[PDB]
Symmetry: D3
């Protein structure tokens, strides 16, 4: 079903450092989304280079990979109706001056470069990102959506 849609959400090293892991997870929880993947990791540069490949050229890339490599990240896969579209809305617009109070970036980050959180911008982008961060065994299902989430 469409209610088997999945999105990738990462909490970057400053989100963790500022003790926001509980608060962020809790927001998805009370929305009514289902957790299907959760993992705490030190991301390899390889992974980060691949993740940020579309920007492998721009000047900021090096320091950006460095930031993400610099601390633990929380990797998450959340499941539910329009979870990609709604998920971006819950995060707020990427720019931390356009982010409205009540969204995550809205209530919580100021710095545009070294922010708190990432979200998939499309269903395609999510599948790509879930592939990259998660092995298929680390995705637990029990929502009988696993048999529908094929592409």
């Amino acid at each position: 079903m469409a209610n088997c849609e999945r999105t990738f959400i990462a909490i970057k090293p400053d989100g963790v450092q500022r003790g926001l892991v509980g608060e962020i997870i809790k927001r998805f929880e009370q929305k009514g989304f289902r957790l299907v993947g959760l993992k705490f990791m030190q991301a390899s540069e390889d992974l980060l280079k691949e993740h940020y490949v579309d920007l492998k050229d721009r000047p900021f890339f090096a320091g950006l990979v460095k930031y993400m490599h610099s601390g633990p990240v929380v990797a998450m896969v959340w499941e539910g109706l329009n979870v990609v579209k709604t998920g971006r809305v819950m995060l707020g617009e990427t720019n931390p001056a356009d982010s409205k109070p009540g969204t995550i970036r809205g209530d919580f980050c100021i710095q545009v470069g070294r922010n708190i959180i990432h979200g998939s911008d499309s269903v395609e982008s999510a599948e790509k990102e879930i592939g990259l961060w998660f092995h298929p065994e680390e995705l637990v299902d029990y929502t009988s959506c696993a048999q529908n989430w094929i592409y």
Copy 2:
């Protein structure tokens, strides 16, 4: 240092089910403890059996394994000074009738059998539980404590 003590907290299937994961995590972060391991898994019978092996002959064993296997759980290693003893106080005492408001069990569970959460009861149980539930490459430490451990 003594500030490198680690303890293991599990959120049992009901806790995940009831949507209490973030809340539970929030309490530990805001107390000041360091997250050094966090995963979402379906516990295997082989793991659950090894984990509860001191109870393997009690009559409720099979059903307790069946409970813990029945849904995904969240496993966690937290770090800090007296994090084991302190973590036991934050959950509240094992029996959710003796549990006090302000603790996790106090605020959140009613049933004694299927309850919300588990925490290590000793540094030794912690070492054992931790190694049982996490491969050592799964741990993430940056706190310059990893060496001490």
Copy 3:
């Protein structure tokens, strides 16, 4: 006065089931609105049929009445300046994909059909709905607005 305006808010069976009654009431409370009616009820089909009469024809009607009949609802009357207009804003837009973080539907529901909450869309609609759900004795006043709330 205009500050004797009243609106009807219902928490539907899933709002109750998901343990959101405290959180929803508390939002009106801290806004500075006054509670003048609160009641926990199993709605009769008659009541629900009358409530949803404008849609007594559309296909979804039957299952919609069924949902509302299927569990306890919390009925509320809140009082205060522009409480109808502001009340809809606090709920968010009815569609759970347009609902912004920080509103009730925003933070809390995903499913468009079986949602969490209802609010009056007009002062007329409120009077109609308050009539329907509440007996005049179940409206407690102590805000000296009872003598002004005549239409």
Copy 4:
């Protein structure tokens, strides 16, 4: 079953006045207890008198009725296992100087006389209070406990 025990909680006029209704409700929901009765009323003298009838000869009787009548209150029946005993712990002990942070009185009231909230002290007081404050058609049960009661 024992999981069909009901208890009565009232939020006295100050509690409503101070905007604490939702918060108070939130604590019971999140503990896991079932709401099976909830109304907003002006308590009558005739009801308040019958309710506090064990105190009808103490010197403060009249004024205590006058307090409870002076503003609308929120009445509630909650359901669950040990909900009476457990509900007493969540409010904190009757005297708001012995009350502990994390309990409702602890977090919210200062004055001993006019305080925030009332809870039943026994299954018997609960049955009595409940029937006194609610007609039985006012209760809403779906939890397949209604029969047990």
Copy 5:
């Protein structure tokens, strides 16, 4: 730096009376702004007259000064990137019917005249207002921004 920008925020007597001081401060805190001034005061009429000088003529002025004089105010100076622009956003639009859920006025005030909170609308206006409410000694710095905040 631009990250030494400062804004003035006042909590008016009703914000205090309604016990909202913790909640308001906490919102700036979790945003990631730095407190550089905080003071609890009974404002002189002189101060208030000067503050509200641009409206020293309009009819509402007298009662408006009276309100602000009528109770304790909390005066605050917060520091950080775009703290003036972001600060207004965190407050919500000044009119309490346009204020969106999730902002401070949004979640918390209804009355347009006697509201909860004030925020600077510009960097100029902030400097003016900080001058007026704060002596330079009451501004504590420890963010090494004091040496940059010159105009």
Copy 6:
């Protein structure tokens, strides 16, 4: 009246640092206590020395002054009935291992030395601390208690 008792709470540099000021304030407001003094300052050595003068010969004196001076703190006078005794309960006992979840230390500090917060331990310490940290024109009272004090 007895409802005019004042007590002094300081938030030490770590508390401000960790972003806990609002939260801490929220607890006192929501309990019902009146804010009658609130400032954000760098404490001087001369003040900190006078404040901790009963400890001036212990070996940790110098370093404790250095801690309290190392960053800005938030000073507060709160008003109400038993606000000193009650305020001590809300913080939790001085040693953050005996502290209970639901109290401020319980929920928020781990380290015993550098901790989050201070509260007066007696009406007399309160009077002394208050006058030490606040000039009397800095206090704001409207509660018709100012006279009583």
